[PDB]
């Protein structure tokens, strides 16, 4: 019923304000708590901050001096602004709904209670890279094939991660296998997607490979045939 | 000289200072070798120096002697007896004022069992009247003489110190051991007392009926809280399981009654002292050792100690 | 933060102890997290678990002080491999900003799985661009650890090759890639090129030639 | 103490009081008597 979806630049220059957004589907935004969480490679889950239903804010002292969380009730969008970014700021940034829990151990008259928060529904994540290096769209090449056979689509030399790949604009889904990228010494990722289709399908079920790389707004298509 | 910090529980504002975590240099079993130890102290047992330095409350007025921790503070009924050739006469008048010709008299070798309970404002675990609720002063028309009321029905009261304390012995000298407060296992809560709101309203009304006979069926009498004085007298001070509570009673004397709840109870926030001073003397003070575990005593209020101001 | 590894045999019951013990009454949340994916709140109030989580995930209630907070996963399966976080809140300590350490659960006794090597020759478009890349795609293997060896004809090739570290597929098997970059003249001047993928005790080969 | 440092045996358990050196430790015969009527 309630789903969240992040959105970000993917690549941001050092010493510059990073900015992300998050959209709530199904529910409202002014009647729930929302938290921003990130996770760097090698570093664990880090709680950045949260915002209330009354839009009251509270930041982790880890990065208190440079984080600004907001909210726009006009259409269930809440934003995040982290400035003075560094190489260590690159991570997957998640967006989650926080539920308030009031643990009571003594007398509520004497304040013998404390509040805890727990995130019960998260987004999917936005990858963000902090690098002086520039963006570059990928080159796409067809890997023509030869019980069944296997064809593929080669996505080489892009930056930064990631790249989405669908087959037949989303129609082909069974037997698809997109492989994790490779960071070559040049500094650019090269991907590869491969589907396993019946042999007789070669003549002539068209196979369109859909490559998308948002940090360069460079989508492309390509067809494979022996 | 005590170096003290607040002890845990980032709780409601200005209740963290109510108990402190204090470290100090203490003598050992060797006269020339010091030791750095720490103890938990209640706020009422320390004062500042003006930094986070503190000292025990009694150090500028009195010497201090800690109670031998094996002696029980629990009152045991005492019977007072007269020597041979003397006699005790008891006034069996069920509506006896305390003075004047008692019509019903008996003699006894010893008085009934009397517990040496020292409390303030509210009289605990005492004897109950058989009819009505008597009111006794020597000059009731004088406002400077304390009015002593005595219930016939017992209005119960439940007190507790929920904090699970630990006692830590500290060798301050050969043969001498100071019993410090180790730490608190579990939550840091507030010591308090419960008295059923229903029974305390009824019982506070019977006092009003008998107060009328000395001030008029038409006059209006009011109950207000204490008007100052030492801490022992501005609160329902008493001993419970070994600790000396000091209960705010503004929730018990905040009522105005005219000429002519039922579910919950009223709660009384109590504070706790360990260094308690002697009542009619100075220079002598007692350190009550820390009681381990959770404390809860159940007793009856059987009387009061009121005072008129001279509506 | 640091990571504490735990190993549980396939089918057994996992006992994940919390990183920090409580000073007072507690309210501990348990999160499941496989890197590269959104965490899954397993238990919020000490033992309360949200909907969509089987009864085999259980937490310890705060009845009497002293009992430690432990997440118990019964009948452990290969899917239960992830990082498990203990978000600890108690009445004595402050606001729990940190999620804590990380218990890295690995499930032992999974069935061994053999790779699915697939080698592609350089596309004509890439060769037309005066470049050429051999892509060797390995999948469906467990344990997730392989070794690749590229050979030009019979001599071994070691320069210009990049290889992915294995990554767990959605079916709990692992996948790896390997890219050999060579000039379009090196591709023609040799008879054939091979990708030799060694997994566990054996090695498997796929060969491709410019025909 | 664990060097050549030492302490008196009693220092960790008891206080100590030296006997007034003028009092004799030599036992003198005591006679126990009963009150009149016993
Ligand atoms: C003198 O007078 C004094 C004044 O009267 C008096 O002080 C009283 O002291 C006692 C004890 O010292 C205090 O009792 C405590 O009360 C706590 C609060 O309990 C109340 O609230 C809970 C929770 O309420 C939320 O959830 C329910 C649904 O579950 C909703 O209906 C509520 O509306 C609320 O939810 C909304 O609101 C929240 C915020 O407001 C929102 O965040 C939320 O999203 C929602 O919007 C109720 O469940 C309680 O109901 C129970 O009690 C009633 C009677 O009131 C009974 O009908 C029945 O038995 C119900 O079960 C209640 O209304 C208690 O939580 C606390 O007990 C816990 O803590 C102690 C120590 O910390 C533990 O040892 C104990 O085991 C309990 O832990 C359990 O619960 C916690 C909390 O969930 C868990 O984290 C924990 O793991 C454990 O769970 C296990 O047990 C659960 C049941 O016990 C079970 O559910 C789990 O599955 C698991 O098995 C304690 O009892 C009392 O508050 C004082 N009075 C006042 C006014 O403060 C004093 O005693 C007198 N006497 C003297 C001094 O001698
Ligand atoms: C009152 O204040 C004293 C300080 O005078 C506190 O004592 C100190 O408490 C800390 C925290 O527990 C101790 O550090 C711990 O040591 C253990 C054992 O190595 C380690 O596992 C922990 O990670 C932590 O580092 C410290 O040793 C201790 N020092 C002394 C002299 O006792 C005390 O905790 C305070 N008590 C309360 C109730 O606030
Ligand atoms: C008024 O009188 C009652 C009873 O005459 C007193 O209650 C008594 O309180 C003491 C300490 O609070 C109890 O001793 C405790 O016993 C428990 C259980 O055995 C033990 O765990 C403790 O360590 C401690 O020894 C005693 O049993 C209890 N008596 C009864 C009959 O309940 C009450 O304290 C008196 N009130 C005042 C203000 O003196
Ligand atoms: C603190 O007293 C002493 C300290 C040192 N040497 C002493 N030598 C006689 C003392 C008296 O007996 C006395 O003054 N006491 C005070 C009142 N008291 C209580 O129990 C009580 C205290 C506080 C609140 C409620 C009740 C009886 C007794 C302890 C005395
Ligand atoms: C107060 O704290 C003490 C420990 O500081 C608790 O004593 C424990 O009691 C349990 C009984 O279930 C025993 O199994 C433990 O061995 C005891 N530990 C120690 C160190 O003595 C005591 O139960 C606590 N009291 C309350 C009411 O919670
Ligand atoms: C004070 O505490 C006592 C006991 O802890 C309470 O008396 C109990 O009342 C219930 C009523 O349901 C009875 O079932 C129990 O048998 C009683 N216990 C005893 C020992 O008598 C009393 O109600 C409490 N009063 C207040 C004002 O808190
Ligand atoms: C203890 O806490 C109170 C309330 O927050 C504060 O005013 C006081 O300065 C604190 N004292 C120490 C020694 O930290
Ligand atoms: C104990 O004495 C030393 C001096 O030797 C002093 O520095 C220290 O502050 C003292 N300890 C306390 C708790 O005051
Ligand atoms: C002892 O010090 C306290 C500090 O609060 C002060 O109020 C009290 O008057 C002092 N006592 C004497 C006898 O000077
Ligand atoms: C006490 O009661 C007796 C009853 O005869 C009465 O004579 C006396 O005046 C009363 N004293 C006071 C102070 O009310
Ligand atoms: C009682 O006090 C009043 C004034 O307060 C006084 O007039 C009266 O004489 C006193 N009664 C006795 C018996 O002393
Ligand atoms: C006061 O009222 C009571 C009835 O409650 C009555 O018995 C008594 O005689 C009255 N006294 C006066 C002086 O009015
Ligand atoms: C009596 O009540 C008043 C009302 O606020 C309060 O200011 C005062 O501190 C109370 N006195 C005592 C001794 O509790
Ligand atoms: C007693 O309680 C009342 C309210 O219940 C509070 O206003 C007052 O300050 C308290 N007395 C003291 C001495 O703190
Ligand atoms: C005192 O020290 C001696 C050292 O030999 C030791 O045997 C003894 O147990 C100690 N006494 C106590 C009460 O710890």
Author numbering:
A (entry chain H): 1 to 82, 82A, 82B, 82C, 83 to 100, 100A, 100B, 100C, ...
B (entry chain G): 128 to 141, 150 to 185, 188 to 309, 312 to 321, 321A, 322 to 398, 409 to 458, 465
C (entry chain L): 6 to 67, 67A, 67B, 67C, 68 to 95, 95A, 95B, 95C, ...
D (entry chain G): 184 to 185, 188 to 223
Task: Please share text taken word for word from the publication where this structure appeared.
Viral entry is mediated by the HIV-1 envelope (Env) glycoprotein trimer, a type 1 fusion machine comprised of three gp120 subunits and three noncovalently linked gp41 subunits, which binds to cell-surface receptors and fuses viral and host cell membranes. Entry inhibitors targeting the gp120 subunit have been developed, with a promising small-molecule lead, fostemsavir, the prodrug version of BMS-626529 (temsavir) currently in phase III clinical trials. We engineer crystallization chaperones to identify a crystal lattice suitable for determining high-resolution structures of inhibitors, spanning a range of >6000-fold neutralization potency, in complex with envelope trimers of clade A and B HIV-1 strains. We report here the engineering of a protein crystal composed of a highly glycosylated trimer and two crystallization chaperones, which were adapted antibody fragments.
To assess the impact of our lattice engineering, we determined the structure of BMS-378806 in the improved lattice with the modified antibody fragments (termed 35O22_3T2S and 3H109L_MM). We observed almost identical unit cell dimensions as the original lattice, but with superior diffraction. For example, residues 65–73 in the constant region 1 (C1) of gp120 could now be accurately modeled with histidine residues at positions 66 and 72 forming an unusual stacking interaction, which was modeled differently in prior structures. Another region of improved structure modeling occurred at the α9 helix of gp41, where weak electron density previously made placement of amino acid side chains ambiguous; the clear density in the new structure allowed unambiguous placement of amino acid side chains and correct registry of backbone atoms. It is important to note that the C1 region and the α9 helix did not directly contact the small-molecule inhibitor; thus the improved resolution of these regions was a consequence of the improved lattice, not an effect of small-molecule stabilization. While the real space correlation for BMS-378806 only improved from 0.91 to 0.95, the improved electron density did allow for greater structural certainty in placement of small-molecule atoms such as the methyl on the piperazine ring or the rotameric state of the oxoacetyl moiety. Overall, the engineered lattice allowed for substantially greater certainty in the positioning of both small-molecule compound and interacting Env-trimer side chains.
